[PDB]
Amino acid sequence: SAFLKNAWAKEPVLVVSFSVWGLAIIMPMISPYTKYASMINKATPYNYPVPVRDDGNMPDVPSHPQDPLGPSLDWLKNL
Amino acid sequence: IVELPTLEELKVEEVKVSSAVLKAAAHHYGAQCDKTNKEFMLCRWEEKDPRRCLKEGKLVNGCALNFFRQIKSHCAEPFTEYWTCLDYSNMQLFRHCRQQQAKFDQCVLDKLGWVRPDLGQLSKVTKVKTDRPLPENPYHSR
Amino acid sequence: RMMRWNQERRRLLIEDLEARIALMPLFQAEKDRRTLQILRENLEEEAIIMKDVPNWKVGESVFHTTRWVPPLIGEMYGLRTKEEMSNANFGFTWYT
Amino acid sequence: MWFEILPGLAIMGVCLVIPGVSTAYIHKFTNGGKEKRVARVQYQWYLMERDRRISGVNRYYVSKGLE
Amino acid sequence: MNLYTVIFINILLSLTLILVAFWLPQRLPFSMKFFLVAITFLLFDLEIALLLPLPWAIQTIKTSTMMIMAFILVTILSLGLAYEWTQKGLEW
Amino acid sequence: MFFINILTLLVPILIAMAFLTLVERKILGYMQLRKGPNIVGPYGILQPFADAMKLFMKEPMRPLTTSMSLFIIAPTLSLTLALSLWVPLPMPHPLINLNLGILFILATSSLSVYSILWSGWASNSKYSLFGALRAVAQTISYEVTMAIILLSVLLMNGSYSLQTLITTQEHMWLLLPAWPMAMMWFISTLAETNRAPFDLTEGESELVGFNVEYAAGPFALFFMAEYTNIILMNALTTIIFLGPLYYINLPELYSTNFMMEALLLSSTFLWIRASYPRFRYDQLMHLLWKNFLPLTLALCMWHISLPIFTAGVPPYM
């Protein structure tokens, strides 16, 4: 601890340097948003979404984009 | 040989409007005309051969054309203002023009009833059933 | 502020990618239609020049498969306008 | 007095705004009053090219609903 | 092409100057430290490379693996530095 | 028209180069209780043109022991790269916008280290070689942190294109966030232009190395190069970290503020020079490898983490 103190006052870059190294190694682990990154980027639609044939055996897939079925990004909205 | 289709076979009307115009109305075209669009697309993907799905494609242009004719009939002025402002920007970004966008979108909800699709709800995969038999042996595998 | 601004920007990134998603089907119908035209048009000229050729069918897939094959940009424009060819090859890189 | 240093700075400044205003109006002249399209990705070059074919030879000319 | 046009004007402007400039008028310095630096420099320069794609990799769906990877790279090189400090290296 | 634009970017910049020299000789003056050059022309405005003409007229000297190409290639390369790096800069519109723009600026800067290496070998005198070796080292070292500092920026910008930052900085300068690196970008910009606090490349009291055997026209070309760079790097600070307000309707207030911020930060390295003694050769590298590189590498990781857990991954494009 004592050295820590002097280190804070002598060679006070490394201290800050390491501190950041860690804080970046922690915040991701503990945060209410970390999960969003993999989603927000997942959602971003870059490649055309090819439509599947309607065997008529699928109640999950929305038959029309504006239908009340399917995925939503309201999480992205009001984020 | 190659059995490449003939020109008369592939001579159909198209929108032929500036990219911006399509872009300005894109959100509503993705809305009013995906039933046929998708179909053409589903034809396109499962039957890798475009030549096979050409017909669906003529339907595509057509559906859109009237989509435009209806716009031409109503809220046309709005649309004209929205596209002109949208075109000026180099990447034709949507946010520079929101005041013009609100008018046309509002109007089409008064005159055409069509609705601007909320953030998303166009990216989501669609189910369209098509008579064209699920091409068996696509890739013409031996 | 950076967190909020990029989240706004990301939503915008989604709003316009979907805009093309909607516009793509039309482009696909257009591209193919035009692509075939280029192949066929080249067929006309092909026949015109390959007729005299001794026992050389006008056109034949170097590949025996009957699957539909996209043509190389080189095939589409090689015998077309050289300028057209150039535009396709290095046009986007030089942009505008 | 320090104000004498200003004449020199002014000449530098005027000569650093010219470039930014110049490049940004020789673009809006050559491209028909519309910012030069930035084609970062092919899609954009495609749309741009498509525009060329749609009218004249130049993409800046832009046909509308009346076509 | 547009770039080519600009660049050749750029060389022309410089060659013009030097030409006028020449026409108008009418053994064993070695320290491993220096070599060592150059080396370190590339080890760091290579790493810069493995770190350059990070802007595209940010958008990768994984994210967890991205950061797990990137953090490991930065940490292992920094330890390389650490040992460079600990050793006489970086002490000229 | 494109040429017109080529001329509009190069000619003005070159003229600005010239007057920076004058401005450096008056702001340093008033700080040191002296008028500076005002007697030639009105208020010294004709002073930069005057020595340019004297420099080109004086006999270019080719040392008995000197390569004749690694000698003439070196100033041509220095001016060519520096004036070239102004090609892809957002003001706000770039002459040649490149999708990987910042990598162009980093790569083009890196190439200038050779000119120093080539000139030092070409001179064939001891002062030149010793100066070049230390110089190349300084420049290269200050490239490793220089590059990492940019990579941290990019990851919060989303792309390598300098044009994107005009849209990233529409609400706040990237100084507020990332100020810790600005400082470290500013100090690195001071090293890479061999300006004062870090002018050991060519120390005068130490080795009166880069231009020892360079006089007249060759002296001028690097010379011009350095000063143009002095501006360019300051301008990159004024786009990457201090984002000038951008209004799409009127593009020149972007360039007007770009003008103001660039001049002030260009004024700052002039002010730094008069204010500080020059650092020792090892004291200079001690800073980068010990003081800055650990700060930069760690803050580099913080800039890969800030995006993810703050769900702020920047939009590509």
Give the range of the structural domain holding residue F293, as residue numbers without chain letter.
Answer: 2-317
Nearest to E80 by CA among E39, E51, E30, E52: E39
What b/e string do you get for E60-81 counting C-beta neighbours within 10 Å, with b at 16 or more? beebeebbebbbeebbebbeeb
Residues of chain F with C-beta less than 8 angstroms from the C-beta of E51: 148, 151, 300
Residues of chain F with C-beta less than 8 angstroms from the C-beta of C3: 306, 310-312
Q: Taking CB atoms and an 8 Å limit, are F10 and E41 in contact across chains?
A: no
Nearest to F214 by CA among F78, F61, F56, F69: F61
- Measured in degrees and rounded to the nearest 5, phi and psi for residue F25 equal -95, 0
Burial of F16 (0-12, 13-18, 19+ CB in 10 A): buried
Q: Taking CB atoms and an 8 Å limit, are A28 and E67 in contact across chains?
A: yes
D-interface mutation test, from F27, F93, F253, most D Cβ less than 10 A away: F93
The rounded distance, in Å, linking the Cα atoms of F258 and F232 is: 12
Query: Among partner residues B37, B48, B56, which is closest to C68 by beta-carbon distance?
Result: B48
Task: Give domain limits for chain E.
Answer: 2-92
The rounded distance, in Å, linking the Cα atoms of F72 and F216 is: 12
Residues of chain E with C-beta less than 8 angstroms from the C-beta of A23: none
E-interface mutation test, from F72, F146, F161, most E Cβ less than 10 A away: F72
> Is D touching E (3+ C-beta pairs, cut-off 8 A)?
no
The rounded distance, in Å, linking the Cα atoms of F147 and F145 is: 5
Helix, strand, or coil (residue D22)? helix
Give the CATH number of domain E2-92; options: 1.10.10.10, 3.40.50.970, 1.20.58.1610, 3.40.50.1100: 1.20.58.1610
Say how many CA atoms lie within 13 Å of F301 toward its Cβ.
Answer: 29
Query: Among partner residues A40, A46, A76, which is closest to C17 by beta-carbon distance?
Result: A46
Nearest to B116 by CA among F276, C18, E15, F306: C18
Q: Does the CB of F315 have a partner CB in chain A at under 8 Å?
A: yes
C-beta atoms surrounding A70 within 10 Å: 19
Q: Does the CB of A27 have a partner CB in chain C at under 8 Å?
A: no
Query: Among partner residues C20, C87, C96, which is closest to D43 by beta-carbon distance?
Result: C20
| Longest CA pairwise span in chain E (Å) | 68
Nearest to F154 by CA among F197, F101, F207: F101
Residues in chain C that come right before a backbone break, where C and next N are over 2.5 Å apart = none
Experimental method: cryo-EM
Cα-to-chain-centroid distance, residue F21:
14
With an 8 Å Cβ cutoff, the interface of chain B facing chain D consists of 16-21, 68, 71-72, 76, 79-80, 83, 87-92
Residues of chain B with C-beta less than 8 angstroms from the C-beta of C29: 40, 56-58, 60-61
| Longest CA pairwise span in chain B (Å) | 58
Give the range of the structural domain holding residue D6, as residue numbers without chain letter.
Answer: 1-67
The residue whose two tokens read 């910049």 is F13
Residues of chain C with C-beta less than 8 angstroms from the C-beta of A79: 7, 11
Nearest to F76 by CA among E8, E7, E20, E15: E15
Alpha-helical (H) ranges within D1-67 are 5-30, 42-54
Length of chain D: 67
The rounded distance, in Å, linking the Cα atoms of B42 and F129 is: 69
Angle between helices F179-192 and F217-240 (to 10 degrees): 170
The rounded distance, in Å, linking the Cα atoms of C41 and B52 is: 19
Q: Taking CB atoms and an 8 Å limit, are B57 and C36 in contact across chains?
A: no
Q: Which two tokens stand for residue A66?
A: 């504006």
Q: Which two tokens stand for residue C95?
A: 């942009």
The residue whose two tokens read 């004719």 is B69
User: F touches which chains (3+ CB pairs under 8 A)?
Assistant: A, C, D, E
Residues of chain E with C-beta less than 8 angstroms from the C-beta of A44: 59
- DSSP letter for D63, please: -
The rounded distance, in Å, linking the Cα atoms of D13 and F16 is: 7
Residues of chain C with C-beta less than 8 angstroms from the C-beta of B43: none
Answer yes or no: are the C-beta atoms of D32 and D60 closer than 8 Å: yes
Q: Taking CB atoms and an 8 Å limit, are F302 and A16 in contact across chains?
A: no
Nearest to F306 by CA among C30, D53, C1, E16: C1
SS3 helix, strand, coil % of chain F, rounded to 5?
65, 0, 35
Q: Does the CB of A79 have a partner CB in chain C at under 8 Å?
A: yes
Q: How many domains does chain F have?
A: 1
- Residue B126's region, left for phi above 0, alpha for psi from -120 to 50, else beta, is beta
Answer yes or no: are the C-beta atoms of C11 and F312 closer than 8 Å: no
Taking CA atoms, F232 is separated from B82, C26, E10, F149, in Å, by 39, 45, 16, 17
Q: Which residues contact F87 (CB under 8 A, 6 or more apart)?
A: E3, E6, E7, E10, F9, F94, F95, F96
- Measured in degrees and rounded to the nearest 5, phi and psi for residue F6 equal -60, -45
- DSSP letter for A1, please: -
Q: Does the CB of C68 have a partner CB in chain E at under 8 Å?
A: no
Residues of chain C with C-beta less than 8 angstroms from the C-beta of A40: 7, 10
Resolution (A): 3.2
Q: How many domains does chain D have?
A: 1
